Scaffold this active site. Structure first.
Site: not given
Length: 298
Positions: A270-271
Site C-alpha cells: 500500500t505504501c
C-alpha cells in the site's frame, strides 16, 4: 460558491508544487515500528525538526523505495496517533474523529504538544499528497478553517498551528469543511474502472494488453461497488479515489507481475499503491485468489 471544487484543488496542488521546490538537505530519522508514535513524537519534535516541509527519509526498524518507506511510516503513524486509544481523539455517534476533552486529565499538561504533533503529521500527509482513512467530525474541520465547542480550544489552536507549519492555512481556507475531508480521505464517489484503467501503471512484464491483465480487468469489471472499494483499499490503504482522479494518485496505481507460482496469493504494498499479481491466465483462478487476498486483509 462561484468556482467549483475541482479547479480549486488544482490551485491547491499547484501552490504546494511551487512551495515544495522553493525548499530544495533533508531529514533523516530512525523509527522503531513497535514504538512508532513515541519515536516520531521525539524524532520529529518541533525542537529537532522545526521545518517539516523538508523531505523526510525514514529507517523503519521493524524491531520499499524510501519514498515508500516514508509513506508506510506516515500512514501507520497517523493510524496510531489518531486512534482513540492514544487519548487525543474520540468518535461521535458515527465514527467521526474530534479532540478528546479529557486529554489533559488523561495525558497531563504536555497534552497540547501532542496536538501540535498530530497537526504536523496530518499536514505532511496533505503536503506529500497521500490520502489517509481519517474520518473527522465536520465541526472539528471548520474550527481549523477559522456553546460547548470551546472546551477543546487549546487542543484546536495547537493542532491548527501544527498544520500551518506544513500547509498554509490560507491555502486551506479555499475549501469547505466537506471539501477538506475529501482532501484528506478522498471523494465519496463510485470507483471508475475507465479512469483507473486509464492511469494504471504496469510492471514486471505486464502491460495493458498482456493476457493476465486482460483477465484482471474482466474480473474487476464484474465487481460490485463494494468490491471495487475493497480492492482499492487493499492496494492503496485508502478506500476512496483522489478528487482529481487516478491521474493524481501518487504513486500511480500499479500492477506488477508476480511469479508463475500459482500458489502465491496476490499481495499488496500500500505504501506504493502496488498490486503484486501472479500470472493467472484463468478468470476463476484470478477472481477467487484476488477476492480471497482482499478478505484476508480485513
Amino acid at each position: 460558491a462561484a468556482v467549483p471544487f475541482e479547479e480549486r484543488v488544482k490551485i491547491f496542488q499547484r501552490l504546494i508544487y511551487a512551495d515544495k521546490q522553493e525548499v530544495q538537505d533533508g531529514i533523516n530519522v530512525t523509527i522503531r515500528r513497535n514504538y512508532i508514535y513515541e519515536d516520531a513524537y521525539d524524532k520529529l519534535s518541533p525542537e529537532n525538526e522545526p521545518d517539516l516541509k523538508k523531505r523526510i527519509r525514514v529507517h523503519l526498524l521493524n524491531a520499499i523505495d524510501g519514498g515508500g518507506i516514508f509513506r508506510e511510516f506516515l500512514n501507520e503513524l497517523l493510524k496510531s496517533g489518531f486512534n482513540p486509544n492514544q487519548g487525543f481523539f474520540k468518535t461521535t455517534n458515527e465514527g467521526l474523529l474530534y479532540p478528546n476533552p479529557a486529554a489533559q486529565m488523561l495525558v497531563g499538561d504536555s497534552f497540547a504538544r501532542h496536538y501540535y504533533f498530530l497537526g504536523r503529521m496530518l499536514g505532511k500527509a496533505l503536503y506529500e499528497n497521500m490520502l489517509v482513512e481519517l474520518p473527522f467530525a465536520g465541526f472539528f474541520l471548520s474550527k481549523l478553517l477559522g456553546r460547548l465547542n470551546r472546551q477543546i480550544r487549546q487542543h484546536c489552536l495547537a493542532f491548527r498551528q501544527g498544520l500551518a507549519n506544513v500547509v498554509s492555512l490560507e491555502w486551506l481556507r479555499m475549501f469547505d469543511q466537506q471539501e477538506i475531508q475529501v482532501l484528506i480521505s478522498g471523494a465519496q464517489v463510485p470507483i471508475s474502472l475507465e479512469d483507473l484503467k486509464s492511469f494504471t501503471n504496469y510492471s514486471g512484464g505486464y502491460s495493458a494488453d498482456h493476457p493476465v491483465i486482460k483477465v484482471f480487468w474482466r474480473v474487476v469489471e464484474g465487481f460490485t461497488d463494494e468490491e471495487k472499494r475493497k480492492l482499492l483499499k487493499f492496494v492503496t490503504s485508502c478506500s476512496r479515489p483522489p478528487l482529481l482522479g487516478f491521474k493524481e494518485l501518487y504513486p500511480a496505481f500499479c500492477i506488477h507481475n508476480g511469479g508463475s507460482d500459482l500458489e502465491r496469493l496476490p499481495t499488496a504494498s500500500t505504501c506504493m499503491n502496488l498490486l503484486k499479481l501472479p500470472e493467472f491466465y484463468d478468470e476463476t483462478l484470478l477472481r477467487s485468489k484476488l477476492l480471497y487476498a482482499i478478505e484476508c486483509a480485513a
